[PDB]
Amino acid sequence: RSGFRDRKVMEYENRIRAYSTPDKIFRYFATLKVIAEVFMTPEDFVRSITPNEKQPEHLGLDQYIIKRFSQEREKFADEGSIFYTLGECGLISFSDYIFLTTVLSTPQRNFEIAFKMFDLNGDGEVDMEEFEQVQSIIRSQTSALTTYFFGADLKGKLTIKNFLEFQRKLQHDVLKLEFERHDPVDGRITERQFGGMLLAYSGVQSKKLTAMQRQLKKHFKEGKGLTFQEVENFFTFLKNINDVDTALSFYHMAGASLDKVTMQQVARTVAKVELSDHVCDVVFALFDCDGNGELSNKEFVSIMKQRLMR
Amino acid sequence: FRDRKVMEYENRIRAYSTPDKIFRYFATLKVISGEAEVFMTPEDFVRSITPNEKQPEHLGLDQYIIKRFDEKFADEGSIFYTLGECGLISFSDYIFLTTVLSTPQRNFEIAFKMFDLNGDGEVDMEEFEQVQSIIRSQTSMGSALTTYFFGADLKGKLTIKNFLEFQRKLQHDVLKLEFERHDPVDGRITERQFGGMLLAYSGVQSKKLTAMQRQLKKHFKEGKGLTFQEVENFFTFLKNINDVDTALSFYHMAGASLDKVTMQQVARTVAKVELSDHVCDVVFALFDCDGNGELSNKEFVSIMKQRLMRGLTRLMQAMWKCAQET
Amino acid sequence: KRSGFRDRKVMEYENRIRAYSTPDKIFRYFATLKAEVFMTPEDFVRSITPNEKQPEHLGLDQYIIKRFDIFYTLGECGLISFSDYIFLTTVLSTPQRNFEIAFKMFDLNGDGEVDMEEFEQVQSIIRSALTTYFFGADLKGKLTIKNFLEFQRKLQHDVLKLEFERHDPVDGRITERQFGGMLLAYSGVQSKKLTAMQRQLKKHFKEGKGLTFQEVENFFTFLKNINDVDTALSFYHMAGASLDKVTMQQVARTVAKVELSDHVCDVVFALFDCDGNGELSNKEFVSIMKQRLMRMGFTRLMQAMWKCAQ
Amino acid sequence: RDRKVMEYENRIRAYSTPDKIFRYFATLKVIAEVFMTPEDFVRSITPNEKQPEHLGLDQYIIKRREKFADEGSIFYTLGECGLISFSDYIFLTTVLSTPQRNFEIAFKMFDLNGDGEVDMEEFEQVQSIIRSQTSMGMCSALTTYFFGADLKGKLTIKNFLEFQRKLQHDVLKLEFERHDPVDGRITERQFGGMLLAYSGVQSKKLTAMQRQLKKHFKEGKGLTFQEVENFFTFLKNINDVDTALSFYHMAGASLDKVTMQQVARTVAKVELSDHVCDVVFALFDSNKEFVSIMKQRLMRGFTRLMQAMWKCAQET
Amino acid sequence: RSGFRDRKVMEYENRIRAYSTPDKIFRYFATLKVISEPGEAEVFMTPEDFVRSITPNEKQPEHLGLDQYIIKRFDQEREKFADEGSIFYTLGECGLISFSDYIFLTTVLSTPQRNFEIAFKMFDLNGDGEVDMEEFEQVQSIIRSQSALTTYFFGADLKGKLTIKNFLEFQRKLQHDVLKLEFERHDPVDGRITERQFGGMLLAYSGVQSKKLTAMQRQLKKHFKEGKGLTFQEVENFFTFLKNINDVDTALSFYHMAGASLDKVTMQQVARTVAKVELSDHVCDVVFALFDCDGNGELSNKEFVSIMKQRLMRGLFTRLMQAMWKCAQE
Amino acid sequence: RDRKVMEYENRIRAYSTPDKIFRYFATLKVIAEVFMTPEDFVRSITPNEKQPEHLGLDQYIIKRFEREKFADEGSIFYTLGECGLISFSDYIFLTTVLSTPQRNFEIAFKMFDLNGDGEVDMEEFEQVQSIIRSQTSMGMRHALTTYFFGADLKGKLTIKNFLEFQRKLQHDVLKLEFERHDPVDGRITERQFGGMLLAYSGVQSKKLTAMQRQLKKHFKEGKGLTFQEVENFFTFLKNINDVDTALSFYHMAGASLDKVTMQQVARTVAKVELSDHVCDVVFALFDCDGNGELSNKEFVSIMKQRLMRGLEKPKDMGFTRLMQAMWKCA
What we know:
EF-hand; two-stranded antiparallel sheet; Calcium uptake protein 1, mitochondrial; hexameric; alpha+beta; calcium binding protein; homohexamer
């Protein structure tokens, strides 16, 4: 089969994603050349950070699609998408690319502080140039919209409250696109796809997704599917693994069973979010010990941390 | 060796013996009433959790100082009174007080929410016994003040707020005893004792303590002294080292010199607290590269952490159990 | 509700009495009759079994009441006075070895003759109605290590049946979980390790066929030679062999001179194999058994090493 | 020179590979296979005893029906006229240390009916196992001996334990002889050097004994070999001898020369002659301590627990 | 029900193979007792016997056994005992193996090329390694330490040198000729072997893994690779693949850390690059049914390269403990 | 006093992070970036070498950005880009090239070039390193790319060229280790070469004196070893595996492990000529006791830890040496 080609193709695509210069990555994943400069569609962007999704055949390295340069022009983004704030109509310039990749992987922690740095008294404000600095610094651990951030004149102040909102939102749209790049029939994704998602940033544990489908097959949960809401609530649960971690440990030490009920519980009390009953059966299929239903917390929290961190 | 062989020993006990073996060693009183119980004074309590402090050699392991079931032992106010006795700490009070010293706020909050399913966090009496019990299964180690917490009927509840305050004052009362064991003079502490206090939970680091009294003196900055407030404050700035750490890192990179000012500025923005202009002399004295005012932030955040964390291959603990019982 | 928290605190207390109180304090708490206070065979087995809740109404100094109408050799109709307790306990515990040496201490030129006032002294030593049975009606009779061992030996058989009846068997058979729990008895919260047994059993079709009391006593005498059963299983392993249901049988046959039913094996290997193989965990097994059979340092210095090894 | 020489040797004994130990104490070479003689054997495991300096380190003596052992010393069943090959050294050293219990359980694995019979190749596996946990582990004419000349016979624990029992004995006579018995007796002091052969300070607590056996006119009598042996036999029991002494202790009776010979007859079923006891108290006086020494002497500040660990490990 | 009797018999025989003298072994597995005039006789083993005595778990014909043989009366005109051109012919007799040749072959089938190249170099300081007759006798003694073919090696006059290049080839044949005899010893049908019999060869030298074999057929039954059979050639390649377990153990470790899955594919890959051999899809299909993890096509590499090197050699906190159990010694 | 200092260092070289280690032994700061002089690099891996008491812990010689040259012409270090200065970045790479076996790179490179011996593009090489680092005790905590993959980075690297880089590096570092002993005329001391051998070895630093006394009574004491003498000895060492078996055979063969045989083993097993003097020193401290006999076992052992630069992450006596200390306290 031509499946030994995919294997070598992803290995390659992956190697780029994690060792090549920002530049090269871009010239690989981005599929649009506009007359003349290259841009990557939201889909491309996301596919550049997800490490296993293949690149469209004849597109690829230094091979893009030629597109001839009002409210009647092409639109790749969508209603609300933070990708419009990027000037174009949902297209991401190489420049926008760096910014965005570094606003995706850095913690609120860092920004909150780095901002407070330029507002010794206020809670955190930055002008057009101050911000340019907060990046050079933050980028050391990894005018499209400049006007969007500081009025049209560039004398506007950027607030940590607004930025966090900006990030907390970029993350939403990115997370949705990942749910989208799986073809959801009626808004639902497979119990297998959902796992593919939860394990993306991990080894070839892609084989334990079979250990899952069996577990579900047995208990008659073999095929409902996971809607985005369900997927998303899990991921807002995941932003707290730290608290969820130390919280799942106490339930352990207190001699309770780390089963579906206590996970749903640690979600309400530690992350103030209601988990779907199915998400838990699926987050268990592939995370309990072996059939146990005993959420192997150590192993869980681990994976989730790199998933949560891309 | 006359003192080091002694200390280096006591320091091993604190660090590896059973809570018990530690309590019998450091505790100084044994109150009689045909039955008797061993009580450690607040003084002993602090000495049992702060290394490099010799116990009265005459007292020591199982050697106490008999009293007659009455006479107060702790300062005027100290949370050590809520303990029922008059400043005394029974083996219970001890195991409890120490576990309420090492576990961070975070953990109690999360632990308390494990009961007030629909609210900030309210734990009744039997739910509390169940929170410590759980919390203790992590601490280095692992009737009088229960009324103080749940009324005299025991039917009241505790709040994660009031308990965090209880813990805040326990940490304060301790900080003051650790400050007292240094013989203040008009409320001042040696530039060397405060230094000592910092390197306290480290090792033979006590040689860089003399490399400090030399540098601190070439600059004529040894003699002004340090008040408990000056000190208490530095320690409130310590409670946020994680944010301090990752705050200095940006300043450093962003270019700025990590000098006496930057520290004080970071202490304000990131830790909402003022750092004594002289406290910084002592900190930089023994934490800056060398002559320069440039502080060695990486090493600073290192020590400061283990200082903030008195105690929290832990086979060595299990090989000890088997090195004596064999 | 907290009906369990209050229960687990009840047990914990009862277990601290049983493990710290004077023989006096003990007997009073469990003894359920009243004159002089006695404890039937049910009371006795319970006063030496941890995690067995005493009928609350009764408990401390609260016993039923009745008028004067091998637990029979004691005197009464199966009821055990207090002296008999302080005796039968010291007997049920101290091993053969000790009595032989205490007896061969008064019969230098034999195996161990012991008259009445010599038995008294033997008891006293060890510790730190039926006597008319042991030494004739004139008390000038003598007791042999042979008869005495036969005494203890039978007592041990009757106190062992007592636990087998303390599970209400259906047609002589007792539950797989009932037998397996009977073992773990003297240990920790390992009571949740049985749930993992019922699983290992349910998989290979063998979850309730039944365990004849005979199978239970044929497995206990097997647990008598542990010290050799251990040194033997260890010679097997080292000899490249495999510690499996086959061999465990062999050993029980040769070294203990007894037969182990394949079933009892499966229940044992169920909750003692290396988490699902067949490879008995000899070291771990012999440990629990020795503590089970009993009712110090470098014992944990080992498990600590293996954890860190991972 | 001595205090330094001996130490060196003791070390070899205690830390060198069997090969390097053998080649040291071994003194011969026949034609070329280096053999060691009973003398040499006992001298290898007896600490504080020096080797003929001219010989020693890879230094032997060349030879080419000259007997080297007593009339019926087990060292005859080895094939030679009393010599011990390298193989016979390894075999014997593990038969000396390893306890009966260990040999019985092994033999009993290969014997469902009886108590412990073993064909040739089985004896080889049980010996592979046994030796793979002896301090020494960390062909011979014997096998024609144990299993007929056809190699089809079976060994009994009775018959093996009996062999091992005789070996122990026959080495004791070699130890007790390597002292110089006059008329067949050994100095009060000599039998003391044996009891304390496995401890540091000898001549310290020794001369204190001589002082005490003088104060009580109990010296110069000399100890026979039967006496000395009857003692060590008593020694191969300290485990029960302990739980025995303690019992007499609590029972009220004082632990004296009498209640001891009393324990002897019941725990090891042997008669300790009076003089043997006078000598023991002479330098012991405290059951708790006493046992300890007789422990390290019976066996022969903890880098040994690391070894207990390799063992547990080898058995899990 | 009585497959038990079958095991004690099976064990007894390995114990003879592992802990007996070469003689007692020869006297047990050997099956021919050739007699001649007037009253002198000798015992020989056929190649089928020789191979059986080294391959554990194969039962010896009940009625034959210890000292029990087939009596043959002394005979290019007489009967042969081995395929056309089986080294066993270079031995002199017609495939028969004398007690002496038994001691030989055993010490040669085992030991590594390395050891032989080094021992030869000792006698040809300037050269690659030549050996006359007496020296070769020495090498054998050196290796072993813890009449018709001698001519075949050193000319008809014993005045001949033997080269490593050559001798090693002899070794190479011996090894190969034995492998065929082991394969053949599983009654092939149309030169192909059962799936179970292949596992048989692979687990041959391991303990009592004989129940995993059953676990295997099941694994195989699900994915319909139930009974296609294995050619000898398919086998011999997996076996020369094994002659590299080292470069393969470290190769699989890297593929592991490098992210990649240890599937039926990467093994093929590993064999290609590392051992310059091509593994057959079916061979891998059997290997995984015997070594996949829970049964998810994930090679348990660790325990695999472990069981295989034992098979490669025909060997008849564990180490993390072994280390310090001596480290405290140094 | 001087002891308490050294201990610290080793203890840092042993447990500290690849950064704490770097900021300690590196001696420059260019304006701003920290660097280490080849002298520093070597100094950081060789245990017991003292760091200029005025530098160390975060201290450096501030330097200002045919300029200041820091290494004997030709040195590989120059390929690092700068004038011979090793940057932390390149510090790790270099320590992970020195410690690991040639075998590994060979295998590792095969994964990315099925056809040939092995090639590796710029990013594929990033993977090899990454993986290979998981091994080393350095990277188990923690410029030239252009030299490697052309200027455009679109080039390829060979195993050959690379192994050539590794080869040339192991050398230049051995030269620097040599020079950092204060050679006169180009000769180290009988005692300093012995030092070199037992460098990454235990605290056996009280046997050099037993060695100087031995060389003494034999008029060995006082001639010195050249660098070539030492080099060939280390090249000899690049095969202690075959030399271990080679010595072991000569032994059983019956030959004595003397200065003459260890000279013949150097030739046939490594195609290198050992000099009498290097032999005299090796034997001076590695002979059994008195006879010229080599204690080959103990010899190979030590030489191995030395051949490993002590950079081979072995948790063997790890938790042991430490937990042993506990003992010597209770």
